[model samples]
Target: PVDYHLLMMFTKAEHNAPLQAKARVALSSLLRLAKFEAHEVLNLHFVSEEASREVAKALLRELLFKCKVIFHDVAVLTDKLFPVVEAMQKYFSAYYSDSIFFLSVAMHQIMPKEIPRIIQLDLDLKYKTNIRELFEEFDNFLPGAVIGIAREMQPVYRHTFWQFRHENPKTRVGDPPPEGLPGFNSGVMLLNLEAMRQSPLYSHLLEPSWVQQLADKYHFRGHLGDQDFFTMIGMEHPELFHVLDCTWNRQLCTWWRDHGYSDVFQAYFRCEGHVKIYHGNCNTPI
Candidate 1:
């Protein structure tokens, strides 16, 4: 039987009460209705601490039945990933946690090289359909594409790139979709590792010098880690990504709508389709 790989990051699950509670929504709902063929198996990967592993194990005993559980130490990955992700973190990480937030940027390199592909997901999601169908999206990647992700469901990037937009005046760098290249949301991502490893263009973009150049050219400063990296890079290299349908990972967050973007928020927030995975980002509940 072929294993269907799905990866998640659930560290300090017992320590972070709210985050733990949110995982119940994400994992419980996933397990509640997940139906797979007999020939297929689900592999659940977690990057976590000892306490969290024990906590998740107990929870899974109740939630999961036949899935394979694989655990990797958080310390192991952080060391290997930091060196590759450090330079960009300064420009994209929050003022407080700093580099810790950039794990998704170098996930391709930090993870075992044997892993040819992976589906990385957030802990605050509600899975509606058979997640296996999401894996089928890999076939739609273009020649140079190494990832599959959805556009930001809000105008958050439009606000983040304000300075550059103000200067360009006629550019579509931070505008909404259809006619614009409005950034990306990383709540759900299909990482094409084989393509990522083979694509010279993708590697070149990851270079510290080039990353810095993009940040400066767009006056880009962000705190969303990997999503920011992908979004900034997408501004220059849109072909490297296969934009997934909005339904695959429908984000439910509306933080930006209530902010100054109230007038133009719906332009970016509107996703016309049935929802598959609900992303409760920015404290938005599913």
Candidate 2:
């Protein structure tokens, strides 16, 4: 059975209002379908000290009556990687960065030294079915990692190699068929904690030396740091990764068009099929 917890990293109050509402609706839907009791879920917020107190007060008003939620300051764990943490704080302060940077730092901080097992997800998501059951299916398949793919963007699979090919013209084509899955949206993922911890790539993020080397060598600077890191990590360790079905992270527009709203809502309550999660794009109502 799927026994792990569902985790989300929420920053920026201004940006998260709509996301929080979606999260509430999704949580309700997850509970209805998965038969999860109140205690089965954990909602955690990562914020600054000032923001933490304010968010807690706000949550008390909005959620204390119904759910158990906790607020954590990112500072709590900064001691583990003070330099990187400080650099991130400066970066966010200067750029007014979003959850992506924080997530990258957290990934670097929280990864277990010896195992690949943590599952992390973004807040901009909705649930159509029971995630726990999806966990059950995942356990059965137990790919070292699992990522959701957007159905329409599947064409990118063919194009992904173009970037590498453009950079390396002499690269020979390998025998194919199950030509490994391409990059996936970082919105949802089941990470192999053991594999991640044992891999040097996770630690590479902490060392500016390696980052500078890559920047110099590849002439690539990523705007979405952690996501870029994830892509690189996946490229380096393809055997441990697997592409999850769209149902787990079904994009909203596609779901609406394919199944219609009524069916989508029904799936939410019934836990039918493998559709466990949903992603609401910019089109999703605020």
Candidate 3:
């Protein structure tokens, strides 16, 4: 028997009605279509506070799946997170407690060796396929690939890397999709803990000095915590990531359309095939 681990941050849902609603819809859709073998268990891990955990418990009560629910106190996760990620926190300008946002980056060490792989997800998605299929993508990871993620379906990264693009006219750093390096979205990710632990290059990049060197090289100043870190590193070492299809994480937010990049918005936002998961990012309706 084996366990398929999945983690989601479920903080502040006790007070945030919108968040609670998203979580409700997310879990409902997930469990309703979830399929698992009798010998396997889907483990749902939530990092949450007391109040939020109560809200999560209430929300999950209405859903059914071949699953095991585990709640981790946010305080404990944050404490375990900060020490390993404290130095890089300054690069992303995150609060001490928000260091929990970096959990995916160092999860290879935070989680037990027994947990060889895990998928981390945002709480604002609707699943249209079996989550077991998502786990199957792990088998497709090429050698040396530690994470599986999709390219961001927005011009957000183009905006972030504007200066870098301007400086290097021949670079594809912020170019639109299909062939360009449009960067990644962390709405869903497959973390290969074993690969991460064994990768010396990946470990060295975690050091503040290496992080600073890359940030300086890219002229990158970010606020999106783990996503930003992943994006920056992906630019330097795309080999470390297995880029998932954009259809897997079809994001619905188009805030950039009206914000100054209207001309090139369609190129990045266009996802032609059926969407396996709809990401209602930036509070966009599903």
| Clash counts for all predictions | 0, 7, 0
Per-model TM against the reference: 0.94, 0.61, 0.98
Which regions of candidate 3 deviate over 4 angstroms?
Answer: none
lDDT, candidate 1, residue 256? 84
TM-score of 3: 0.98
Q: Mind giving the per-residue lDDT tens digits that candidate 1 earns over 66-118?
A: 57889877777776677777788788773333444566666677666777778
Best by lDDT: 3
* Window of ten residues with lowest summed lDDT in model 3: 89-98
Give candidate 3's whole-model lDDT. 0.90
Q: Which lDDT tens digits does candidate 3 get at residues 138-181?
A: 99999899999998888888879889999998888988777888
**Higher-scoring candidate on lDDT, 1 or 3:** 3
> What are the per-residue Cα lDDT tens digits for candidate 2 across 1-286?
2234444555555446665576566445555565445545433334345554565356445433123444556555434445454443332223322443545345524543532244566556766665555555446433334332222222222233455547765542111123433344566666555544554645564466655554344334344345444444455554445556666765443333344334323222222255567766544542
Worst 10 residues of 1 by lDDT: 94-103
- Give per-model CA RMSD: 1.8, 8.0, 1.1
